[PDB]
């Protein structure tokens, strides 16, 4: 309860950790820890009745986040872990269910069959992109096929529980915390041309309420990099 890091403080009360490993450390690299280990809280999204989903590409969502966005634009490469806290607060009179996964290497498929999706339609820096529940038309400029029942990656959406995940069921549970280590082939990769994680939130059982309750439930995502280092002089 009320854990702090740097000059920030959030509070909790169950933690699911990665693929069984805690994130640890390894020219010679430099290891910054004093000014970056803090909880970057993204601005909250609203879960309405007919909502469909959200995704954030993870080492891109902190690209305009102040000092961490100055370590990225000064340094070519880098390897980080992550620690995500998702918590939505509804009353005892709301009902629904979320699925909070964290997909490594989530290559997405374009709407047009011949091209590839462009940069702005894949990754919104510190802003959520949204799934839909219809098909997206093909003769446009360039967009992502965001039908939610194929999860944007051509795979069945029920099978997404093989990735490290957590359910948020508003009847019993309230929050979900994940810890994700460094999952990559090369030991240090470029952070401007590679989004090595993707946090998805998919509401399976949609929201419902009676007339009079608040017609929206907000969702707060809080990311905090742990065990980060760069290669530079």
């Amino acid at each position: 309860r009320s854990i702090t890091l740097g000059n920030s403080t959030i509070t909790t009360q169950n933690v699911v950790v990665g693929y069984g490993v805690w994130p640890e450390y390894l020219d010679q690299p430099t290891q910054p820890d004093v000014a970056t280990c803090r909880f970057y809280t993204l601005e909250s999204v609203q879960w309405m009745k007919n909502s469909a989903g959200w995704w954030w590409k993870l080492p891109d969502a902190l690209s305009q986040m102040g000092l961490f966005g100055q370590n990225m634009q000064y340094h070519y490469l880098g390897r980080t872990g992550y620690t995500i806290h998702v918590q939505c607060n509804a009353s005892k009179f709301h009902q629904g269910c979320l699925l909070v996964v964290c997909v490594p290497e989530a290559e997405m498929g374009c709407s047009n069959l011949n091209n590839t999706p462009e940069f702005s339609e894949l990754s919104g820096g510190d802003s959520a992109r949204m799934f839909t529940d219809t098909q997206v038309g093909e003769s446009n400029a360039k967009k992502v096929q965001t039908a939610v029942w194929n999860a944007g990656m051509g795979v069945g959406v029920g099978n997404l529980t093989i990735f490290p995940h957590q359910w948020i069921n508003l009847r019993t549970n309230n929050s979900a915390t994940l810890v994700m280590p460094y999952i990559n082939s090369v030991p240090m990769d470029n952070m401007f041309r590679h989004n090595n994680l993707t946090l998805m939130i998919i509401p399976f059982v949609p929201l419902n309420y009676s007339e009079g309750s608040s017609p929206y439930v907000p969702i707060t995502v809080t990311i905090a990099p742990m065990c980060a280092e760069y290669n530079g002089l």
Partner: antibody
Amino acid sequence: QVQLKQSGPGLVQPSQSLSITCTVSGFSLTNYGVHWVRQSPGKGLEWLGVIWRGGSTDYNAAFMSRLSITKDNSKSQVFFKMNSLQADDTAIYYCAKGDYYGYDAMDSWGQGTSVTVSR
Amino acid sequence: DIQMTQSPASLSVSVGETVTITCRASENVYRNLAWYQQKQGKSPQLLVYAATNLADGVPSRFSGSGSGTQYSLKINSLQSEDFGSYFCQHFWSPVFTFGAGTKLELK
């Protein structure tokens, strides 16, 4: 929250060019695309063109050589140009943002600038 | 391209009935349809997007349904502000085409 608005000429001579500029507030141009819809009481609503959030644009087929839409991300402005302006363009002109929860529908519309092309 | 045929051209109903407006497409659009309501002398307001979902400030009187090439919009109980112009418009592929339009007199 305050939203987009536009400002144009109002009247133009035939076989000239047309220039309206739509300026937004409350959101950025790197997350939503802006459309152009022409309300004419003789032909109903018609869709002219759009510039997506990536920067690449897409126009109607019947107005390909006449339209040129552009935007600039820093100044929060768009610029669209129409030329050769025949007498069937006596209508009112709207700019409206798209991508209402990622669904490519017009969220909120401008106040509109009515144009008339006669002398 | 794809043409939208909206019917009827106008209506004359009173306050407190049900009303159904349908518009048919040329081919399949996969539920990518938006409905707008316009009053006199103003910009249109979005009513229903993607053929089922209601908008933000729109009350639950309106209801849209359909799949494939036939869609429909239903208002269960009229009020004293639901008269004006109504359009249906698809966003499947450019060129996006609007409907013909309909009117409510509220005699």
